[PDB]
Amino acid sequence: PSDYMPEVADDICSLLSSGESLLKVCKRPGMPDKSTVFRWLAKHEDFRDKYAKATEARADSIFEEIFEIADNAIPDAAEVAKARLRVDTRKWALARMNPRKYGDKVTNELVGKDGGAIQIETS
Amino acid sequence: PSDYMPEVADDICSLLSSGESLLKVCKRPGMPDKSTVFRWLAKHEDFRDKYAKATEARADSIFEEIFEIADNAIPDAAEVAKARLRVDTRKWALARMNPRKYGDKVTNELVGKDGGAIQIETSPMSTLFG
Amino acid sequence: PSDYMPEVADDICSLLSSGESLLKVCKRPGMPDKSTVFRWLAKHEDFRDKYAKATEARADSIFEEIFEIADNAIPDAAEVAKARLRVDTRKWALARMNPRKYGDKVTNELVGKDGGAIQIETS
Amino acid sequence: PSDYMPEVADDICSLLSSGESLLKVCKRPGMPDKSTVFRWLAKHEDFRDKYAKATEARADSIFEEIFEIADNAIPDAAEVAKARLRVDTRKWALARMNPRKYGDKVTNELVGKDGGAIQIETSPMSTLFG
Amino acid sequence: PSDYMPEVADDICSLLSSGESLLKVCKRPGMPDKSTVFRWLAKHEDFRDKYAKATEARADSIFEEIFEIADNAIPDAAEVAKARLRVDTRKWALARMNPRKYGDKVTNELVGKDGGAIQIETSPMSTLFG
Amino acid sequence: PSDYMPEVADDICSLLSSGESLLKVCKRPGMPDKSTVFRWLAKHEDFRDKYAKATEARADSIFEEIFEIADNAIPDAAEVAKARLRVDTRKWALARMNPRKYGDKVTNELVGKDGGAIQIETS
Amino acid sequence: PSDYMPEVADDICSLLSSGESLLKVCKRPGMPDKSTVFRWLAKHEDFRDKYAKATEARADSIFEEIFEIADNAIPDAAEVAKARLRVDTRKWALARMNPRKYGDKVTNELVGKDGGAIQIETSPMSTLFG
Amino acid sequence: PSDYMPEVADDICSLLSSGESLLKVCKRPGMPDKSTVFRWLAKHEDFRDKYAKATEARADSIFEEIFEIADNAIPDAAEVAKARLRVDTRKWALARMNPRKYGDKVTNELVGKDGGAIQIETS
């Protein structure tokens, strides 16, 4: 299949929301390929809408998945290394799926020379 | 369990508050699967509010837990690597669960050229960037 | 036990102050569980007060503990790796227990293009 | 193939859009070598515009691919190290292919001395920095 | 030793000034335990002031010590890893003991779009954030 | 050879553009040495021009090279370590060859205390 | 060689310009020891100016050298680790030799709360910080 | 010895300038101990002067030392690890000995949302 289908568009959003990679999604029988989905993502606002939301939902699912990957890692060198890679990939990706929620968090206390006020000279 | 059940939702919040992760909670007897919990969250504001509070408590619980995971790590290479992964995952997650409390902390002493004042020159716009 | 007790609240602050994790604290006979303590932390300002101070005191204790963990590490691969993890966990936690004191420290010399003045155009 | 051929250029854009890297594409049958592609880019605006669009699509494709590379890594030390290298290279590249979407994300809570307001003192210039 | 004893406190300050850590100092003959030292600090301003000075001196001493720990490390894997841990711990601690002297140092050349001036557009508040 | 030659200057830019290190370039028969090239880079604006452009072109070539180095690494510990070093060196260098294009990318959401407005007091 | 000798100083500048490090240069036949070179630098402005130029050239030379060190690394664990150390040392040094050219490069897209404008509230000073 | 001596103060500055750690300096026969030197550093401006300069000179010496440590490292795992630690310690220390010269260097291109102008609202 490779034609626009609202019912598969929905079906797509559901699997994504559950955390499943789009690759592992389209790889399903009767489903549009990645390329087609990205094509639709440029010809269906009604889709781009259900996709952005599904992406934030997918992130929330992945957030819980990282605890399981870390905690249930097989205590073998290569397996722990693989688990670390799976977790690091997800952490990095979550920040891009929902920046406001999963991006880095820093509090910067801004002070001037020697802890005094910030000194500025203007021209 | 597919239908929204307040009593089970309440239990979920209590377990999360104590530091347990959602996927682990959903494996307990009589608990809805994760997909179902997210669905409940999506359609029940009462649960969302209580879950947000549970998330704050969960972070405070994990903050104490990371000391235990590190200190009690079996002194075996792979076991220490796994303990490190479990701690790093929690550290990262804590900052997102409560950014104000658990985000990074930096004090930046801001100075200018050669340790003097910060030198700023303002000029009229040279291009149409408005 | 699981009722409010000012005497155990104090007892709690003491162990914390010495650097002991709350987990290893409540784990003591007759002591309230973590959950209860966090509950109290929302029903006793008189407690929230003695707890915030105890947390800064606990940090000061942990600060000295990291030198001992590093310097007395058994010179074996896994043991040194464990010692590093114990130290890294404490360093990260100290910044959160007392941000002004244990957070990162940076001095930024701010200059403009080519070392000249910072150039700004406003609209 | 040395002469600019729109049909081959179009194919290149489609392959890149799907996530394939340029050097790998140039190894396919009938494809121009990399140097030639860069030359085509240099002298054909039509190709440059379509290639820029293909780059955006390529990044979206690699973003999904990194999950697969990590999750399907053979659990062997060297194989995991290679998977990690393949993922780190893609992460770095994604930020450059689409900075807005894939660059780092940070929220900075800015406060001043002791958690109060940011203290700023302005003074007349003390040196000729204009 | 539980009662506050100025002479012992003075000794503690001298030892710390030379670079020794508090827990190691407290293991010496006749020294109060760490908990006791913190208690003394809490209730004797004279000791707190002298201890703060001792902390500055301690940092200057550790700054020289890190070169020695690195340079004299036994060339054995675990021994080098331990030396690295001892040095990293000291580096981190130095910045906190004397932020002005030992914090990170960065020079940021600040420029605007395309290397030109920093472009700023000011607008009236669009939301009630005051 | 060690005299100014526009034809070798061009020849130089070509190899660079293809991604080849200047070292591996001058190392070619009849070609000026590195030192001489850097000398020319201070006596031929017509050269400094064709060189800056060639450097940005070289970066674009290297950008594609890193995917090949990573993906085709021999799955052996030392070989993967070498591949990682080759890639890391190139990533670092690309940012310097074309800063606007290959430098780090960060989006900073700037907010004030507790997520409110940034509080500033001036004197 | 202890006395300042322009011809030897000139040679030093040429060697450094080509990428050689000072300690290695000082091991060559007839060269002054490092301490002596620093002494010459201290008291001869002519040498300092030429040495500063040589430093810029040295950095441009090392920039090309790092590709070679990485690409030609013997594929042996310790040899690759040493190559990595040699490259990391040069990267760090390059930024200091020519900060403008070799320092880190970052583009920061600055936005405010929720992706909107940066919200700033100014207030009268509440403490004597002038 | 443990009395103020201008001649040993000078002797001190010389060794430091050559890059030698103060520890390895005082450890010399007839020389004041570290503690005493730090004491003098608070009772002799004439000393604090010759010391700050010596520290910047020491940094310049150490800067050249790191190339030698890296390039001449014995190609053995532990020896390379030790060499890396010696170099990392020196890099970190150089930034503190001369911040303006050896501190980190970053050029930040500051832009606003979507690459447009930086948007600011004031109250």
Short mmCIF file of all heavy atoms in Angstrom, two decimals, chain A residues 29-77:
data_model
loop_
_atom_site.label_atom_id
_atom_site.label_comp_id
_atom_site.label_asym_id
_atom_site.label_seq_id
_atom_site.Cartn_x
_atom_site.Cartn_y
_atom_site.Cartn_z
N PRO A 29 2.58 -5.28 7.86
CA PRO A 29 1.79 -5.63 6.67
C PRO A 29 0.67 -4.67 6.31
O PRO A 29 -0.19 -4.34 7.13
CB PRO A 29 1.27 -7.03 7.02
CG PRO A 29 2.40 -7.60 7.83
CD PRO A 29 2.75 -6.45 8.74
N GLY A 30 0.67 -4.22 5.05
CA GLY A 30 -0.36 -3.31 4.58
C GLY A 30 -0.13 -1.85 4.93
O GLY A 30 -0.90 -0.98 4.51
N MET A 31 0.92 -1.58 5.69
CA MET A 31 1.24 -0.22 6.12
C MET A 31 2.14 0.56 5.15
O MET A 31 3.02 -0.02 4.52
CB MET A 31 1.91 -0.26 7.50
CG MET A 31 0.94 -0.50 8.64
SD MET A 31 -0.12 0.94 8.92
CE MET A 31 0.66 1.63 10.38
N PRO A 32 1.93 1.89 5.04
CA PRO A 32 2.72 2.75 4.16
C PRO A 32 4.19 2.73 4.59
O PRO A 32 4.48 2.51 5.77
CB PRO A 32 2.10 4.13 4.36
CG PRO A 32 0.74 3.85 4.90
CD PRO A 32 0.96 2.68 5.80
N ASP A 33 5.11 2.97 3.67
CA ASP A 33 6.51 2.97 4.08
C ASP A 33 6.86 4.33 4.69
O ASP A 33 6.11 5.30 4.54
CB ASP A 33 7.44 2.67 2.89
CG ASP A 33 7.29 3.65 1.76
OD1 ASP A 33 7.20 4.86 2.03
OD2 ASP A 33 7.28 3.21 0.59
N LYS A 34 8.00 4.38 5.38
CA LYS A 34 8.48 5.60 6.03
C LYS A 34 8.40 6.79 5.11
O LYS A 34 7.86 7.85 5.46
CB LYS A 34 9.94 5.43 6.47
CG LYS A 34 10.51 4.01 6.33
CD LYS A 34 10.50 3.48 4.88
CE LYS A 34 11.36 4.33 3.94
NZ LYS A 34 11.33 3.82 2.56
N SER A 35 8.96 6.62 3.92
CA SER A 35 9.00 7.65 2.90
C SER A 35 7.62 8.22 2.63
O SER A 35 7.44 9.43 2.55
CB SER A 35 9.59 7.06 1.62
OG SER A 35 10.80 6.39 1.92
N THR A 36 6.64 7.33 2.48
CA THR A 36 5.27 7.75 2.22
C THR A 36 4.71 8.53 3.40
O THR A 36 4.05 9.57 3.23
CB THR A 36 4.36 6.54 1.96
OG1 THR A 36 4.84 5.83 0.81
CG2 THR A 36 2.93 6.98 1.71
N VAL A 37 4.97 8.04 4.61
CA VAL A 37 4.48 8.71 5.80
C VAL A 37 5.04 10.14 5.86
O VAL A 37 4.31 11.08 6.16
CB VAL A 37 4.87 7.95 7.09
CG1 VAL A 37 4.32 8.68 8.31
CG2 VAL A 37 4.35 6.52 7.03
N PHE A 38 6.33 10.29 5.56
CA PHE A 38 6.94 11.62 5.59
C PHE A 38 6.34 12.47 4.48
O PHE A 38 6.25 13.69 4.61
CB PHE A 38 8.46 11.52 5.44
CG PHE A 38 9.16 10.95 6.65
CD1 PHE A 38 10.01 9.85 6.54
CD2 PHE A 38 8.99 11.54 7.91
CE1 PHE A 38 10.67 9.33 7.66
CE2 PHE A 38 9.65 11.03 9.03
CZ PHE A 38 10.50 9.93 8.90
N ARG A 39 5.93 11.82 3.39
CA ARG A 39 5.31 12.52 2.27
C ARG A 39 3.97 13.07 2.77
O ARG A 39 3.67 14.25 2.58
CB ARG A 39 5.10 11.56 1.09
CG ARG A 39 4.33 12.16 -0.10
CD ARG A 39 4.43 11.27 -1.35
NE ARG A 39 4.05 9.88 -1.07
CZ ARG A 39 4.28 8.86 -1.89
NH1 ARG A 39 4.91 9.05 -3.05
NH2 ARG A 39 3.91 7.63 -1.55
N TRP A 40 3.17 12.21 3.41
CA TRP A 40 1.88 12.61 3.94
C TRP A 40 2.07 13.78 4.91
O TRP A 40 1.28 14.72 4.94
CB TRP A 40 1.21 11.47 4.71
CG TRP A 40 0.74 10.31 3.89
CD1 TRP A 40 0.75 10.20 2.53
CD2 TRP A 40 0.16 9.11 4.38
NE1 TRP A 40 0.21 9.00 2.15
CE2 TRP A 40 -0.16 8.30 3.27
CE3 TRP A 40 -0.13 8.62 5.67
CZ2 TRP A 40 -0.75 7.04 3.40
CZ3 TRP A 40 -0.71 7.36 5.80
CH2 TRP A 40 -1.02 6.59 4.66
N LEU A 41 3.13 13.70 5.71
CA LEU A 41 3.45 14.73 6.69
C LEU A 41 3.65 16.09 6.03
O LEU A 41 3.96 17.08 6.69
CB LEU A 41 4.71 14.32 7.47
CG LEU A 41 4.63 14.29 9.00
CD1 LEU A 41 3.37 13.57 9.45
CD2 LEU A 41 5.86 13.60 9.54
N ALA A 42 3.47 16.13 4.71
CA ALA A 42 3.63 17.37 3.96
C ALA A 42 2.43 17.58 3.03
O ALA A 42 2.49 18.38 2.10
CB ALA A 42 4.92 17.33 3.16
N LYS A 43 1.35 16.85 3.28
CA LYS A 43 0.15 16.96 2.46
C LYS A 43 -1.12 16.73 3.26
O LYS A 43 -2.21 16.57 2.69
CB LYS A 43 0.19 15.95 1.30
CG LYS A 43 1.36 16.11 0.34
CD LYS A 43 1.20 15.20 -0.88
CE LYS A 43 1.08 13.74 -0.47
NZ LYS A 43 0.76 12.86 -1.64
N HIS A 44 -0.99 16.69 4.59
CA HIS A 44 -2.14 16.47 5.45
C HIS A 44 -1.95 17.13 6.82
O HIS A 44 -1.39 16.53 7.74
CB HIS A 44 -2.39 14.97 5.64
CG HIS A 44 -2.77 14.26 4.38
ND1 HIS A 44 -3.98 14.46 3.75
CD2 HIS A 44 -2.09 13.37 3.61
CE1 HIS A 44 -4.03 13.72 2.65
NE2 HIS A 44 -2.90 13.05 2.55
N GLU A 45 -2.42 18.37 6.95
CA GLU A 45 -2.32 19.10 8.21
C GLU A 45 -3.03 18.29 9.28
O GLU A 45 -2.57 18.19 10.42
CB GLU A 45 -2.95 20.48 8.07
CG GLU A 45 -2.79 21.38 9.28
CD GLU A 45 -3.23 22.80 9.00
OE1 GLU A 45 -2.59 23.47 8.16
OE2 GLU A 45 -4.23 23.25 9.61
N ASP A 46 -4.16 17.70 8.90
CA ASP A 46 -4.96 16.88 9.80
C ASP A 46 -4.09 15.74 10.34
O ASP A 46 -4.35 15.19 11.41
CB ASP A 46 -6.16 16.30 9.05
CG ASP A 46 -6.94 15.30 9.88
OD1 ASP A 46 -6.41 14.19 10.14
OD2 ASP A 46 -8.09 15.61 10.27
N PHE A 47 -3.05 15.41 9.58
CA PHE A 47 -2.13 14.35 9.96
C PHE A 47 -1.01 14.94 10.80
O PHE A 47 -0.72 14.44 11.88
CB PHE A 47 -1.55 13.68 8.72
CG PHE A 47 -0.65 12.53 9.02
CD1 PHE A 47 -0.99 11.59 9.99
CD2 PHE A 47 0.53 12.35 8.31
CE1 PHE A 47 -0.17 10.50 10.25
CE2 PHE A 47 1.36 11.26 8.56
CZ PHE A 47 1.00 10.33 9.53
N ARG A 48 -0.39 16.00 10.30
CA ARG A 48 0.70 16.65 11.01
C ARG A 48 0.28 16.95 12.45
O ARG A 48 1.11 17.00 13.36
CB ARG A 48 1.11 17.94 10.31
CG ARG A 48 1.57 17.75 8.87
CD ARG A 48 2.28 19.00 8.33
NE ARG A 48 1.39 20.14 8.14
CZ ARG A 48 0.42 20.20 7.23
NH1 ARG A 48 0.19 19.18 6.41
NH2 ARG A 48 -0.33 21.29 7.14
N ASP A 49 -1.03 17.14 12.65
CA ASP A 49 -1.58 17.44 13.96
C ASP A 49 -1.57 16.22 14.86
O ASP A 49 -1.06 16.25 15.98
CB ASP A 49 -3.02 17.96 13.83
CG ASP A 49 -3.65 18.27 15.18
OD1 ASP A 49 -2.93 18.23 16.21
OD2 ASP A 49 -4.86 18.57 15.22
N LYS A 50 -2.15 15.13 14.36
CA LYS A 50 -2.22 13.89 15.10
C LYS A 50 -0.84 13.25 15.28
O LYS A 50 -0.67 12.35 16.11
CB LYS A 50 -3.16 12.92 14.39
CG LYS A 50 -2.85 12.74 12.91
CD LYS A 50 -3.84 11.82 12.26
CE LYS A 50 -3.73 10.40 12.80
NZ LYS A 50 -4.84 9.56 12.27
N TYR A 51 0.15 13.72 14.51
CA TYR A 51 1.50 13.17 14.57
C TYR A 51 2.36 13.86 15.62
O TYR A 51 3.14 13.21 16.33
CB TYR A 51 2.17 13.29 13.20
CG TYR A 51 3.43 12.47 13.05
CD1 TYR A 51 3.38 11.14 12.62
CD2 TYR A 51 4.68 13.01 13.36
CE1 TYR A 51 4.53 10.38 12.51
CE2 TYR A 51 5.85 12.25 13.25
CZ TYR A 51 5.76 10.93 12.82
OH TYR A 51 6.90 10.16 12.73
N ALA A 52 2.23 15.18 15.71
CA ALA A 52 2.98 15.96 16.69
C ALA A 52 2.53 15.54 18.09
O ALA A 52 3.35 15.42 18.99
CB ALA A 52 2.72 17.45 16.49
N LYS A 53 1.23 15.33 18.26
CA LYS A 53 0.70 14.92 19.55
C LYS A 53 1.15 13.50 19.86
O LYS A 53 1.53 13.19 21.00
CB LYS A 53 -0.83 14.98 19.58
CG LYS A 53 -1.53 14.16 18.50
CD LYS A 53 -3.02 13.99 18.81
CE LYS A 53 -3.78 15.32 18.88
NZ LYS A 53 -3.96 15.97 17.54
N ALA A 54 1.12 12.64 18.85
CA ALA A 54 1.53 11.27 19.02
C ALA A 54 3.00 11.24 19.40
O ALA A 54 3.43 10.37 20.15
CB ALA A 54 1.29 10.48 17.74
N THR A 55 3.79 12.17 18.85
CA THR A 55 5.22 12.20 19.15
C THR A 55 5.43 12.57 20.63
O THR A 55 6.29 12.02 21.29
CB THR A 55 5.95 13.20 18.23
OG1 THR A 55 5.96 12.69 16.89
CG2 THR A 55 7.36 13.44 18.72
N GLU A 56 4.66 13.52 21.14
CA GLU A 56 4.82 13.85 22.55
C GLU A 56 4.36 12.68 23.42
O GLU A 56 4.94 12.41 24.47
CB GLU A 56 4.07 15.14 22.87
CG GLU A 56 4.84 16.35 22.36
CD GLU A 56 4.12 17.68 22.59
OE1 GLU A 56 3.40 17.81 23.60
OE2 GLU A 56 4.29 18.59 21.76
N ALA A 57 3.33 11.95 22.97
CA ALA A 57 2.84 10.79 23.71
C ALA A 57 3.87 9.68 23.65
O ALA A 57 4.09 9.01 24.65
CB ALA A 57 1.52 10.28 23.12
N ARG A 58 4.48 9.50 22.49
CA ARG A 58 5.53 8.48 22.32
C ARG A 58 6.66 8.78 23.31
O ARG A 58 7.17 7.88 23.96
CB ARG A 58 6.04 8.51 20.87
CG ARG A 58 7.27 7.60 20.54
CD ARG A 58 7.70 7.82 19.08
NE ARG A 58 8.94 7.13 18.70
CZ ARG A 58 9.66 7.45 17.62
NH1 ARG A 58 9.28 8.45 16.83
NH2 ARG A 58 10.78 6.78 17.33
N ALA A 59 7.03 10.05 23.45
CA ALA A 59 8.10 10.43 24.37
C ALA A 59 7.78 10.03 25.81
O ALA A 59 8.66 9.55 26.54
CB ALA A 59 8.34 11.96 24.31
N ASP A 60 6.51 10.22 26.21
CA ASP A 60 6.10 9.91 27.57
C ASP A 60 6.22 8.41 27.79
O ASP A 60 6.53 7.97 28.90
CB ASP A 60 4.68 10.40 27.84
CG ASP A 60 4.59 11.90 27.96
OD1 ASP A 60 5.62 12.54 28.25
OD2 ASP A 60 3.50 12.46 27.77
N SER A 61 5.97 7.64 26.74
CA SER A 61 6.10 6.18 26.85
C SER A 61 7.57 5.78 26.98
O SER A 61 7.94 4.94 27.82
CB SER A 61 5.51 5.50 25.62
OG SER A 61 4.09 5.52 25.65
N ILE A 62 8.40 6.37 26.14
CA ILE A 62 9.83 6.09 26.13
C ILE A 62 10.46 6.47 27.47
O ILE A 62 11.37 5.79 27.93
CB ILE A 62 10.50 6.82 24.97
CG1 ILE A 62 10.00 6.22 23.65
CG2 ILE A 62 12.06 6.68 25.05
CD1 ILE A 62 10.38 7.07 22.42
N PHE A 63 9.97 7.54 28.08
CA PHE A 63 10.50 7.98 29.37
C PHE A 63 10.41 6.84 30.40
O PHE A 63 11.34 6.60 31.19
CB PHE A 63 9.72 9.21 29.85
CG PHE A 63 10.21 9.75 31.17
CD1 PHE A 63 11.38 10.48 31.26
CD2 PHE A 63 9.49 9.52 32.33
CE1 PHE A 63 11.84 10.98 32.50
CE2 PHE A 63 9.93 10.01 33.57
CZ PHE A 63 11.12 10.75 33.64
N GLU A 64 9.30 6.10 30.39
CA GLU A 64 9.15 5.02 31.35
C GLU A 64 9.97 3.82 30.89
O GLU A 64 10.45 3.04 31.71
CB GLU A 64 7.68 4.64 31.51
CG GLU A 64 6.86 5.72 32.26
CD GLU A 64 7.44 6.05 33.62
OE1 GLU A 64 8.06 5.17 34.26
OE2 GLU A 64 7.25 7.20 34.08
N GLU A 65 10.11 3.67 29.58
CA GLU A 65 10.90 2.55 29.06
C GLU A 65 12.37 2.59 29.52
O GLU A 65 13.00 1.54 29.77
CB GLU A 65 10.81 2.53 27.52
CG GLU A 65 11.71 1.50 26.83
CD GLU A 65 11.54 1.44 25.31
OE1 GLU A 65 11.52 2.51 24.65
OE2 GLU A 65 11.44 0.31 24.77
N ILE A 66 12.96 3.78 29.65
CA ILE A 66 14.37 3.82 30.04
C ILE A 66 14.65 3.26 31.41
O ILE A 66 15.72 2.70 31.63
CB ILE A 66 15.01 5.24 29.89
CG1 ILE A 66 14.37 6.23 30.87
CG2 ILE A 66 14.84 5.70 28.45
CD1 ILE A 66 15.04 7.63 30.81
N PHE A 67 13.70 3.37 32.33
CA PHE A 67 13.91 2.82 33.67
C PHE A 67 13.98 1.30 33.58
O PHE A 67 14.83 0.66 34.22
CB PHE A 67 12.76 3.17 34.60
CG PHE A 67 12.74 4.62 35.03
CD1 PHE A 67 12.13 5.57 34.23
CD2 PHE A 67 13.36 5.02 36.21
CE1 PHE A 67 12.13 6.93 34.61
CE2 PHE A 67 13.36 6.37 36.60
CZ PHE A 67 12.74 7.31 35.78
N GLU A 68 13.10 0.74 32.76
CA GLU A 68 13.06 -0.72 32.59
C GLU A 68 14.33 -1.23 31.92
O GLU A 68 14.89 -2.26 32.31
CB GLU A 68 11.83 -1.13 31.78
CG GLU A 68 11.60 -2.64 31.75
CD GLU A 68 10.35 -3.05 30.95
OE1 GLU A 68 10.35 -2.85 29.70
OE2 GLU A 68 9.37 -3.56 31.56
N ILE A 69 14.81 -0.51 30.91
CA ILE A 69 16.01 -0.96 30.22
C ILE A 69 17.22 -0.98 31.15
O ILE A 69 18.01 -1.92 31.12
CB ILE A 69 16.31 -0.07 28.98
CG1 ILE A 69 15.18 -0.28 27.95
CG2 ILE A 69 17.67 -0.42 28.38
CD1 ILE A 69 15.17 0.73 26.81
N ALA A 70 17.35 0.05 31.98
CA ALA A 70 18.46 0.15 32.91
C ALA A 70 18.34 -0.89 34.03
O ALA A 70 19.28 -1.68 34.28
CB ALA A 70 18.49 1.58 33.53
N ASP A 71 17.17 -0.93 34.66
CA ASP A 71 16.98 -1.82 35.80
C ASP A 71 16.99 -3.29 35.44
O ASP A 71 17.43 -4.11 36.25
CB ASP A 71 15.67 -1.52 36.55
CG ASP A 71 15.66 -0.15 37.22
OD1 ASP A 71 16.76 0.43 37.41
OD2 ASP A 71 14.54 0.31 37.57
N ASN A 72 16.55 -3.63 34.23
CA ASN A 72 16.51 -5.04 33.85
C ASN A 72 17.66 -5.48 32.96
O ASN A 72 17.59 -6.55 32.33
CB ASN A 72 15.20 -5.36 33.13
CG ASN A 72 13.99 -5.13 34.01
OD1 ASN A 72 14.09 -5.06 35.24
ND2 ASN A 72 12.82 -5.03 33.38
N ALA A 73 18.73 -4.68 32.90
CA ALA A 73 19.87 -5.03 32.06
C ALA A 73 20.53 -6.32 32.58
O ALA A 73 20.69 -6.49 33.78
CB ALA A 73 20.90 -3.90 32.07
N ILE A 74 20.92 -7.20 31.67
CA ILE A 74 21.61 -8.42 32.07
C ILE A 74 23.01 -8.00 32.52
O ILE A 74 23.73 -7.30 31.78
CB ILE A 74 21.69 -9.40 30.87
CG1 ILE A 74 20.28 -9.86 30.48
CG2 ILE A 74 22.63 -10.55 31.20
CD1 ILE A 74 20.18 -10.56 29.14
N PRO A 75 23.42 -8.40 33.74
CA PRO A 75 24.73 -8.04 34.27
C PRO A 75 25.93 -8.73 33.62
O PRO A 75 26.70 -9.46 34.26
CB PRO A 75 24.58 -8.33 35.77
CG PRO A 75 23.67 -9.50 35.77
CD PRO A 75 22.63 -9.13 34.74
N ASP A 76 26.07 -8.46 32.33
CA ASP A 76 27.16 -8.95 31.49
C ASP A 76 27.72 -7.69 30.82
O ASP A 76 26.95 -6.80 30.46
CB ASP A 76 26.60 -9.89 30.43
CG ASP A 76 27.49 -9.98 29.22
OD1 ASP A 76 28.56 -10.62 29.32
OD2 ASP A 76 27.12 -9.40 28.17
N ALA A 77 29.03 -7.61 30.65
CA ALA A 77 29.65 -6.41 30.07
C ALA A 77 29.02 -5.87 28.78
O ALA A 77 28.64 -4.69 28.71
CB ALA A 77 31.15 -6.65 29.84
#
